[PDB]
Amino acid sequence: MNLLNAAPTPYVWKYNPVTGKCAGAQQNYGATIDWVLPGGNSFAYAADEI
Amino acid sequence: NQLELMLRNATNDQTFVDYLGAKNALYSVPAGSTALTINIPARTWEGMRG
């Protein structure tokens, strides 16, 4: 597959409860699948579909 | 061979989880000190067990 057409990881937001203003957004690294070193071609498609 | 054919099929493939189910972190505490603070950055905590 092509990683340029692969779906990116979503941006999750930070709330900052005390001030109440948005604290920004981040690349959602906290929930990511490890698929290129162990997975290969069989799991690259699966991770993209997820 | 039938077991292989019914096990190579993608919908039914082996799935294993580590029994400890815990990211393991060691935080240094000097000898005389009585307090420790564990500050870690923003994360999606998506399915924390405890």
Added chain:
Amino acid sequence: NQLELMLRNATNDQTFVDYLGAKNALYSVPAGSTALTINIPARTWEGMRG
């Protein structure tokens, strides 16, 4: 009863602040010593007064 009922209303309930408004930390300084280092763990300082 009217007064107590307009005070039981949650939109208007008592709010009290400590006048000092200061966390109090005592850092030991021995006799001969002339310097002191106050290191603190990572924190947000979300409304610190000084």
